[PDB]
Design an enzyme around this catalytic site. Structure first.
Site, PDB file in Angstrom:
ATOM      1  N   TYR A  36      38.947  34.690  46.441  1.00 15.22           N
ATOM      2  CA  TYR A  36      40.378  34.825  46.667  1.00 15.22           C
ATOM      3  C   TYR A  36      40.663  35.190  48.121  1.00 15.22           C
ATOM      4  CZ  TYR A  36      40.344  40.098  46.606  1.00 15.22           C
ATOM      5  OH  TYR A  36      40.140  41.437  46.850  1.00 15.22           O
ATOM      6  N   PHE A  43      46.412  40.983  54.534  1.00 13.18           N
ATOM      7  CA  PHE A  43      45.646  39.941  53.835  1.00 13.18           C
ATOM      8  C   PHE A  43      44.315  40.524  53.316  1.00 13.18           C
ATOM      9  N   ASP A  44      43.926  40.271  52.038  1.00 13.26           N
ATOM     10  CA  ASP A  44      42.635  40.742  51.518  1.00 13.26           C
ATOM     11  C   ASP A  44      41.815  39.565  50.958  1.00 13.26           C
ATOM     12  OD1 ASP A  44      40.464  42.196  49.902  1.00 13.26           O
ATOM     13  OD2 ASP A  44      41.975  42.143  48.294  1.00 13.26           O
ATOM     14  N   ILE A  63      45.950  43.265  37.978  1.00 16.21           N
ATOM     15  CA  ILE A  63      47.369  43.197  37.719  1.00 16.21           C
ATOM     16  C   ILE A  63      47.688  42.137  36.665  1.00 16.21           C
ATOM     17  CG2 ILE A  63      47.909  44.050  40.011  1.00 16.21           C
ATOM     18  CD1 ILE A  63      48.314  41.256  40.947  1.00 16.21           C
ATOM     19  N   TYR A  89      52.579  45.287  41.071  1.00 18.66           N
ATOM     20  CA  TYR A  89      52.515  46.751  41.169  1.00 18.66           C
ATOM     21  C   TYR A  89      53.874  47.422  41.002  1.00 18.66           C
ATOM     22  CZ  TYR A  89      47.875  45.852  42.702  1.00 18.66           C
ATOM     23  OH  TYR A  89      46.587  45.389  42.819  1.00 18.66           O
ATOM     24  N   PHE A 106      48.487  34.957  46.206  1.00 19.63           N
ATOM     25  CA  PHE A 106      47.060  34.668  46.390  1.00 19.63           C
ATOM     26  C   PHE A 106      46.747  33.168  46.392  1.00 19.63           C
ATOM     27  CE2 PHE A 106      47.347  38.839  44.397  1.00 19.63           C
ATOM     28  CZ  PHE A 106      46.440  39.599  45.086  1.00 19.63           C
TER      29      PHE A 106
HETATM   30  C1  LIG Z   1      45.952  48.396  45.048  1.00 20.63           C
HETATM   31  O1  LIG Z   1      44.774  48.439  45.870  1.00 20.63           O
HETATM   32  C2  LIG Z   1      44.161  47.242  46.130  1.00 20.63           C
HETATM   33  C3  LIG Z   1      44.722  45.989  45.898  1.00 20.63           C
HETATM   34  C4  LIG Z   1      44.013  44.843  46.185  1.00 20.63           C
HETATM   35  C5  LIG Z   1      42.741  44.957  46.716  1.00 20.63           C
HETATM   36  C6  LIG Z   1      42.137  46.180  46.861  1.00 20.63           C
HETATM   37  C7  LIG Z   1      42.854  47.355  46.591  1.00 20.63           C
HETATM   38  O2  LIG Z   1      42.310  48.613  46.794  1.00 20.63           O
HETATM   39  C8  LIG Z   1      41.208  49.006  45.983  1.00 20.63           C
HETATM   40  O3  LIG Z   1      40.853  46.332  47.301  1.00 20.63           O
HETATM   41  C9  LIG Z   1      39.956  45.212  47.397  1.00 20.63           C
HETATM   42  C10 LIG Z   1      39.241  44.884  46.099  1.00 20.63           C
HETATM   43  C11 LIG Z   1      37.845  44.220  46.349  1.00 20.63           C
HETATM   44  O4  LIG Z   1      36.744  44.845  45.696  1.00 20.63           O
HETATM   45  O5  LIG Z   1      39.030  46.017  45.257  1.00 20.63           O
HETATM   46  C12 LIG Z   1      38.959  45.775  43.830  1.00 20.63           C
HETATM   47  C13 LIG Z   1      40.293  45.676  43.168  1.00 20.63           C
HETATM   48  C14 LIG Z   1      40.715  46.279  42.034  1.00 20.63           C
HETATM   49  C15 LIG Z   1      41.929  45.871  41.214  1.00 20.63           C
HETATM   50  C16 LIG Z   1      42.083  46.666  39.903  1.00 20.63           C
HETATM   51  C17 LIG Z   1      43.322  45.869  41.864  1.00 20.63           C
HETATM   52  C18 LIG Z   1      43.441  46.971  42.897  1.00 20.63           C
HETATM   53  O6  LIG Z   1      43.545  44.485  42.344  1.00 20.63           O
HETATM   54  C19 LIG Z   1      44.185  43.516  41.686  1.00 20.63           C
HETATM   55  O7  LIG Z   1      44.580  43.632  40.557  1.00 20.63           O
HETATM   56  C20 LIG Z   1      44.480  42.294  42.586  1.00 20.63           C
HETATM   57  C21 LIG Z   1      43.865  41.015  42.041  1.00 20.63           C
HETATM   58  C22 LIG Z   1      42.380  40.982  42.261  1.00 20.63           C
HETATM   59  C23 LIG Z   1      42.047  41.020  43.721  1.00 20.63           C
HETATM   60  C24 LIG Z   1      42.625  42.269  44.401  1.00 20.63           C
HETATM   61  N1  LIG Z   1      44.050  42.493  43.980  1.00 20.63           N
HETATM   62  C25 LIG Z   1      45.014  43.009  44.754  1.00 20.63           C
HETATM   63  O8  LIG Z   1      46.128  43.182  44.313  1.00 20.63           O
HETATM   64  C26 LIG Z   1      44.649  43.466  46.117  1.00 20.63           C
HETATM   65  C27 LIG Z   1      45.883  43.449  47.057  1.00 20.63           C
HETATM   66  C28 LIG Z   1      45.455  44.015  48.416  1.00 20.63           C
HETATM   67  C29 LIG Z   1      46.293  43.599  49.619  1.00 20.63           C
HETATM   68  C30 LIG Z   1      46.812  42.163  49.638  1.00 20.63           C
HETATM   69  C31 LIG Z   1      47.457  41.837  48.337  1.00 20.63           C
HETATM   70  C32 LIG Z   1      46.448  42.022  47.173  1.00 20.63           C
END
Ligand SMILES: COc1cc2cc(c1OC)OC[C@@H](CO)OC/C=C/[C@@H](C)[C@@H](C)OC(=O)[C@@H]1CCCCN1C(=O)[C@H]2C1CCCCC1
Length: 116
Positions: A36, A43-44, A63, A89, A106
């Site tokens: 992703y 951006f992540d 999410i 969120y 994404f």
């Molecule tokens: C709210 O905090 C974050 C959000 C998101 C990324 C993130 C966060 O900090 C921990 O770190 C990077 C990943 C990689 O290992 O960590 C695991 C993710 C856990 C899951 C449970 C949550 C946090 O993520 C998601 O549900 C979604 C979908 C999967 C990929 C990550 N995504 C995010 O929402 C991202 C977020 C970060 C900034 C750009 C938008 C997306």
């Protein structure tokens, strides 16, 4: 963008950018494996870590939108997702990374999915 929500409130929208293969789409509980590139309309990227992202689909370990969208993917598919905060969120947000009522995008590639 295609609305794939059950309430049909346009909370998660999807375009297919590269078509996948086979005809099985992944079931609840499948261990699913993705790449992703993702952001708020910060951006992540999995390609940053050098390593595929993995979770069990439909167990609310991501999410609410990801469990919905990744459920509609097929092996090898790349998709574009656009997400109102109620399937992301929320109005609580998730500070510091995410504010209140943030819309998310994404690019997702579903690499493979196996069985749980
Ligand atoms: C709210 O905090 C974050 C959000 C998101 C990324 C993130 C966060 O900090 C921990 O770190 C990077 C990943 C990689 O290992 O960590 C695991 C993710 C856990 C899951 C449970 C949550 C946090 O993520 C998601 O549900 C979604 C979908 C999967 C990929 C990550 N995504 C995010 O929402 C991202 C977020 C970060 C900034 C750009 C938008 C997306």
């Amino acid at each position: 963008g295609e609305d794939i929500t059950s309430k049909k409130d346009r909370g998660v929208l999807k375009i297919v950018k590269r078509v996948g293969n086979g005809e099985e789409t992944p079931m609840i509980g499948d261990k699913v494996y993705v790449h992703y590139k993702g952001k708020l309309s910060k951006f992540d990227s999995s390609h940053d870590r050098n390593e595929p992202f993995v979770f069990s689909l439909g167990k609310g370990q991501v999410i609410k939108a990801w469990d919905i969208g990744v459920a509609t993917m097929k092996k090898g598919e790349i998709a574009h997702l656009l997400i109102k905060p109620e399937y992301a969120y929320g109005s609580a947000g998730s500070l510091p990374k995410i504010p209140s009522n943030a819309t998310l995008f994404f690019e997702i590639e579903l690499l493979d999915f196996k069985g749980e």
